[PDB]
Amino acid sequence: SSVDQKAISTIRLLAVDAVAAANSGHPGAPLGLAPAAHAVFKKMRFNPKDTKWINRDRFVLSNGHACALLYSMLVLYGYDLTVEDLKKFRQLGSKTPGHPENTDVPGAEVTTGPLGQGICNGVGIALAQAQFAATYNKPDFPISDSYTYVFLGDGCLMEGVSSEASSLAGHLQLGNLIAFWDDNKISIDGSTEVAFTEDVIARYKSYGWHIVEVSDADTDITAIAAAIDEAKKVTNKPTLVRLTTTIGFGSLAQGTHGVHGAPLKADDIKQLKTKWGFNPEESFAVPAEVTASYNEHVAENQKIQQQWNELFAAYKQKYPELGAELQRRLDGKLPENWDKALPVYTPADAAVATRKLSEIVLSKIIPEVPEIIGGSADLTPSNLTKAKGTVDFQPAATGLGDYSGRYIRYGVREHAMGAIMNGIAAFGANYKNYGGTFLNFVSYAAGAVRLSALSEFPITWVATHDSIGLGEDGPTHQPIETLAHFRATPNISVWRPADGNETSAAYKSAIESTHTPHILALTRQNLPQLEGSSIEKASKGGYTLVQQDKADIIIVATGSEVSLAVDALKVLEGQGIKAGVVSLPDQLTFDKQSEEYKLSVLPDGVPILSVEVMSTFGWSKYSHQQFGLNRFGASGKAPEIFKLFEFTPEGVAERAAKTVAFYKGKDVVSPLRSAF
Amino acid sequence: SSVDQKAISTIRLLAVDAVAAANSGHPGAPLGLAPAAHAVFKKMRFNPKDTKWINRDRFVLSNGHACALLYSMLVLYGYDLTVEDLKKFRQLGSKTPGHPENTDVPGAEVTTGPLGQGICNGVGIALAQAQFAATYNKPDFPISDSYTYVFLGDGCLMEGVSSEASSLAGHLQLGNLIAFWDDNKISIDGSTEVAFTEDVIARYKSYGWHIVEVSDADTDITAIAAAIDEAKKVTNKPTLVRLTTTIGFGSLAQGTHGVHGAPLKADDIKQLKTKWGFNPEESFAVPAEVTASYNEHVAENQKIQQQWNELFAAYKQKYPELGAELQRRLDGKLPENWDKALPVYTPADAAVATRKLSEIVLSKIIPEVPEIIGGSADLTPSNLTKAKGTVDFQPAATGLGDYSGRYIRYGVREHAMGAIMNGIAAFGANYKNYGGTFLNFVSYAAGAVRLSALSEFPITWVATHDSIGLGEDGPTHQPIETLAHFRATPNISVWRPADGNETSAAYKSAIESTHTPHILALTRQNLPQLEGSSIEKASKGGYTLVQQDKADIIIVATGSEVSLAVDALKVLEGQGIKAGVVSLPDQLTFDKQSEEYKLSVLPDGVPILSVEVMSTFGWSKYSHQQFGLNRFGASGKAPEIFKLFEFTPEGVAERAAKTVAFYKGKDVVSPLRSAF
Ligand SMILES: Cc1ncc(C[n+]2csc(CCOP(=O)(O)OP(=O)(O)O)c2C)c(N)n1
Ligand SMILES: Cc1ncc(C[n+]2csc(CCOP(=O)(O)OP(=O)(O)O)c2C)c(N)n1
Ligand SMILES: O=C(CO)[C@@H](O)[C@H](O)[C@H](O)[C@H](O)COP(=O)(O)O
Ligand SMILES: O=C(CO)[C@@H](O)[C@H](O)[C@H](O)[C@H](O)COP(=O)(O)O
Ligand SMILES: [Ca+2]
Ligand SMILES: [Ca+2]
């Protein structure tokens, strides 16, 4: 009460002092949201000493620039983050980076800062919670009953990705999602009147959300707590709580854009402290009564988790099969020998498009690995991402699925699908989740994909129609730059399998992943089964498909161009040129192999030509010369497009012959060599 | 009447026959939207023989997969597109590609197919029209009074980019925008009930749009025409017309997802023809009464344009200064010697961040070039994109600006900003428009940026905070992959100027552009004025900044790393190594120079090391070894991040020395050489 007010002041002043010490960062939203943070964390169930308790409530700061607020809460509650870490806010190597990162910050569920992402991550956490609860809960066994609390600002509400995810969350009736809009009428460019005058509340009602409005969120923590209680009674709608706040509340500069994103003036900090009963000569004060009050809540939460552990033990007795499955998932382990379900092919099998091979893999592994769920952005019958016989993830009230379903209809929402996948991964419980679209439209989701990599989440894009091989839809659909973009992003495995065995290797990697997102670039068109491919060899990312001791040239290729390279080898033989072929289904996986393995694939002393029907960027890592497509495509029958751009056996052979000639009398060393 | 019905049938059957001949494409939405297309084009003012008449109404097919409908309208109205072109729908090299492309299709204002883009392009066309009208119209001189008509589907309404643009368009009170939702309750994955159950109409009202609902848009062309008349009376709101249609109307498979995206069965086409009075044995029928009726409307429109030409002549008499400016703009010519306003610097001038240099350029050229308008995605005081003293583009009713304003508050809406910029460029009248955000968040707009390149639109991104040099905001804000992504996209000039003179060259290129979008990657941090830079040399895209005959190594760098390379040259001199320095402010501009010019910059016989604090992808085009940053960044003071990653004079010198050693006794040829 008095202690509640002191806690709020403590939070506010820790945040302002952290910004002040860094002389960098964002004091405004922390000042405005400290009452709400105090109220929400008092309602949340969490263990600072076990950040991975699966039935914890989750908190996401979607307005991630406000992270001094989050860090202050985590410090006050005794997470593995201290006042000394706050004093190192925004400093190189600290645990308090300028935007929250789940890899570095204990209690940061996701990485935010790029606006709009966190609320979508919250949708995914809530989606996973609903699916998890439907899969495991039993009468008298509420294994999963947690909530997902999200703070977001005007910036997040302006980013289209949040509209996508909010439309979908309302459709999915996600009643355990409770989001709070920091309604402070200020963004970087000033008043929201200059660019953001829509009726946000009316829009959220149009999505099927419940609304609670708190008119004085600067002080009315009673109403904020009551809004949470109200939201919990509305079990079939996500709730948006409108928190009408003053940005920078208490500052001389409150209610202005100047308090958004720069440190307060020293005299402003002094009057903040004196107004709230603190010592203006002191920084980073933590009144012991605040610590005590917060510790009481932690102790209660720890007793809740202790009881949850006993509930889980009793669950394993009453439901031994589900209990063992749940234990395995919480231990982060896939089913024993699950990969024996992966399809295997021989060169005698028929040609198949890698999108169809992907369908077949999914159909075999989904029944074996319950923690696989996924969907498509309105391309299910084109991406081939649904296993026959599975049920869609939908609220049962719709009649269209159930929360125990495993297939998500994302609609035409690639960016939100990407960020929702990140939230599903962030939920934990070993979820291995995927999302289908055309490769060219993965680009719509770049904001989220990049965060999958930075956050180290094992999400998977099923990215079909990978090239000019899709044909008639034409250049607005045909990737050119796309693989280069994602390969140039740290920590993305970009698999472009050539055939059945390679597609199984790509899935083995994607599903086994624990820290690396995957993009599977798959074909519309049929490709032959290759002589020399296997799951084992393709699992190395790059391998020698056709070994030619005494090669005059090695052709390195991916996907649809491996078969082309093999056909070019035969043309070259007729010209008296001996070629080897390397298949490079994943450059990242290949890069992580030993130097000796990599040199066995790309040796010294032989010219290497790359062939891939998109950008040549990156390919000089593996080749001396590069045959690619650095112009936009065309609308026509796919074989005619390939002929137009000379991606034919003869066109490849011609460039291979020119490569052999270009290096005659030169000393050639592997592209893997470098000066540093 | 009877002729109206025959026209609608003609449109429907041309579209279905085009799909049938290609055995590829999308018959459903063309069948459903033919009544609306017929009605809208009858209300539109356009000249098939002058696609660039500046006061034409514009039409945008945002659901671009429905382009057989658009092509049928263009053929029937006598644009430079014939039945023979329709017979070549989706065929290599035809003028009827599988999605409309403004470069290839007469009467296609923009390139659509990637969902959500076209409606945003329409917002930009309407924005430009409003700004253009406010700038030039005078009493009795309605130089510009045209409308922007957009067709869009459920897919476009699900893509977040359309929410961004619709929020902004409602805020901007764009009363000459009239959009039509194809409300057919079907997408690729089936019924919209599976993923898209929001109250679209309520959402559009929340943005401040006017609504008209047409309950039977399969037949009620009277109500569609009346909806247009109603929309035109609402001058301070964009209008959404809900067209309740049956996808594939008339087909045996109408009302199903199967009619969305594959050819109809032959017997289905036969019964379509017989039901509508056509010969089932005939394809591509064009009844002469339809041609006649459409020609009447063209003739009336041509008389309207003829009168507009006389109005323009009278305008030039009454308002000679504005008239000459308008003529110049319609001739596609910038003001004579406008570039004399570009700022010029010497090495004696102070260090300045290239974001601040950009502000100064804009402040000098905006007063000289009226066709420059632009804005920022809620980063105006950080991107520095507004010239002091200019007025924002806002409806005057808000009191916050005027439609004659030149500065757009886009809000936190990068993707819509990108697509709106494309629409402003598509309007014509020599508009040279720009949009500011942080470089890392240009990625949120990749869907639109790619279309800027494919559409050949001279738009400009003012992309500040380009690297780890931004410091404390950390890795969620620091570009790594971003330049590689856009450089790998065909037809994007990616300028990364090092200093004042280079920044002026970058703007000279961006503003003179007529077919190439520009991204200007600009710094937060200060950089020195370079000895050896000039507008003239930087205008070549790459140039020798420090010439060293007898160089042991050449260091090629961009942006902030050019000064670093110059400092490394001094360290190397102390180690007995002579270096030259190349500055490469735009790789695309450089690539377009003559081979002899390029070789004068990157000669044979000398190792070349690239230095740029982001991905090394692409750099092997210009260098033998590459020093870059292929991992994510860090949150800290920027100079400490540079030190951590060894982007220091000593760290560059060390790698340069290792490069010299690596090539000792090797024959080195320019990276510009290739085997083919
Ligand atoms: C995708 C993206 N675009 C731009 C930014 C730059 N940026 C950070 S905060 C911010 C404005 C935030 O306004 P709001 O969310 O209302 O925060 P508040 O001012 O209330 O603290 C912007 C534009 C960003 N972080 N992410
Ligand atoms: C950004 C983007 N994502 C995905 C696609 C793939 N695609 C084309 S049409 C379409 C569905 C369109 O549904 P709707 O707009 O309702 O069209 P209709 O079925 O009514 O013809 C999809 C998902 C695309 N063209 N663009
Ligand atoms: O327009 C689009 C996607 O941009 C879709 O309809 C796309 O054209 C699909 O290829 C068609 O629906 C046909 O699908 P598929 O034969 O490629 O599986
Ligand atoms: O959080 C964000 C952007 O992601 C913004 O507030 C960003 O941090 C800006 O850098 C701050 O507002 C400070 O701006 P500036 O000093 O870099 O111009
Ligand atoms: Ca705000
Ligand atoms: Ca539809």
Curated annotation (Swiss-Prot), chains A, B:
Enzyme Commission number(s) from the entry: 2.2.1.1
Site feature: Important for catalytic activity: H26, H260
Enzyme category, top tier: transferase
Positions with a binding annotation for thiamine diphosphate: H65, G113, P114, L115, G155, N184, H260, E414, F441
GO annotation, biological process: pentose-phosphate shunt
Cofactors: Mg(2+); Ca(2+); Mn(2+); Co(2+)
One GO CC term on file: cytosol
CDD domains xref list: TPP_PYR_DXS_TK_like, TPP_TK
Domain of life according to the entry: Eukaryota
Catalytic reaction(s) noted: D-sedoheptulose 7-phosphate + D-glyceraldehyde 3-phosphate = aldehydo-D-ribose 5-phosphate + D-xylulose 5-phosphate
Keyword Calcium included in the entry's annotation: yes
Cofactor note: Binds 1 Mg(2+) ion per subunit. Can also utilize other divalent metal cations, such as Ca(2+), Mn(2+) and Co(2+).
Active site per the UniProt annotation: E414
Keywords, sorted A to Z: Calcium, Magnesium, Metal-binding, Thiamine pyrophosphate, Transferase
Binding-site residues for substrate, renumbered to this chain: H26, H260, R355, S382, H465, D473, R524
Binding residue positions for Mg(2+): D154, N184, I186
Record-stated family: Belongs to the transketolase family.
Subunit structure: Homodimer.
NCBIfam families hit by this protein: tktlase_bact
PANTHER family named among the record's database cross-references: TRANSKETOLASE, TRANSKETOLASE 1-RELATED
Protein name: Transketolase
Protein source organism: Scheffersomyces stipitis (strain ATCC 58785 / CBS 6054 / NBRC 10063 / NRRL Y-11545)
